[PDB]
């Protein structure tokens, strides 16, 4: 047989026969699709499949659960009419990410009939689903969440302006006041999945002694997150599982106090 496989990404619509790989056939009819290993052992050629099915048993990199929504194009034979989305490597979810997504949606549905779509976002495990629902249905209304409710786990070792002094023959008392970017994946997938990269500010004093002991004390504050979950973002990846961008105000001050030895 020969089933039609459409690609959202390139727009193409190739007739691909059940005995041939999706990548190869696309390449034959002139469509350049991404790849690297060509041996079923990475994710360079991964696509989302949103309808139809395939035989990718020839590949191994994807977990059992990944394979429900993701295919490896360099090892995939269609078994039906397929719509897919190539170029998905940079949006793919890891197993532990998919588990959190699956569980958090289940819990979100448990409160999705009385969502305010304004004010405070509810913290924790439902936040990513709440922030995304607001993206679709909130018509750009500002939202907020206190910096102490987000669930940040921030260490000195993760703050560049502090560490550029701390890794260096620097001794004495240093006042530090600077913006830095926080990739909230450091704080675990449930914060990342709605905050992504966010600009923060730390103000405090670092003491470094000749003996190598140091201590730091100060605070952290956050600028507003710009929430955009369009089709090319990680947040959009969790969504596909149009809107309007919006701000998340993150008021308050987080306190920071640590010490160590070089
Ligand atoms: S290119 Fe490595 S899995 Fe297809
Ligand atoms: Cl600055």
Numbering used by the authors: 2 to 242, 251 to 271
Text of the article:
Data from these crystals were collected to 2.3 Å in the space group P21 and phased using anomalous scattering data from the metal centres of the [2Fe-2S] iron–sulphur cluster. The structure of pectocin M2 revealed an N-terminal domain with the predicted ferredoxin-fold (residues 2–94, in red), separated from the colicin M-like cytotoxic domain (residues 116–271, in blue) by a linker region (residues 95–115, in green) that forms an α-helix. There is a significant difference in the orientation of the cytotoxic and ferredoxin domains of the two pectocin M2 molecules in the asymmetric unit (ASU) with a root mean square deviation (r.m.s.d.) of 3.4 Å, between main-chain atoms. The relative orientation of the ferredoxin domain, linker region and cytotoxic domain gives rise to a non-linear dog-leg structure. In the pectocin M2 structure this key aspartate (D226) adopts an analogous conformation. However, no density for a metal ion is observed in this position, which is occupied by a water molecule. The observation that there is a relatively large difference in orientation between the cytotoxic and ferredoxin domains in the monomers of the ASU is suggestive of such flexibility and indicates that the crystal structure may not be wholly representative of pectocin M2 in solution.
Pectocin M1 and M2 consist of an M-class cytotoxic domain with lipid II degrading activity, fused to a plant-like ferredoxin domain (Grinter et al., 2012a; 2013,). This ferredoxin domain, which contains an intact [2Fe-2S] iron–sulphur cluster, substitutes for the helical receptor binding domain and IUTD of the M-class bacteriocins discussed above, that are required to deliver the cytotoxic domain to the periplasm. We have previously demonstrated that Pectobacterium spp. are able to acquire iron directly from plant ferredoxin under iron-limiting conditions through a receptor mediated process and that the bacteriocins pectocin M1 and M2 parasitize this system for cell entry through presentation of a ferredoxin domain (Grinter et al., 2013). The lack of an IUTD indicates that the ferredoxin-containing pectocins utilize an existing ferredoxin uptake mechanism to cross the OM, without direct interaction with the Tol or Ton complexes in the periplasm.
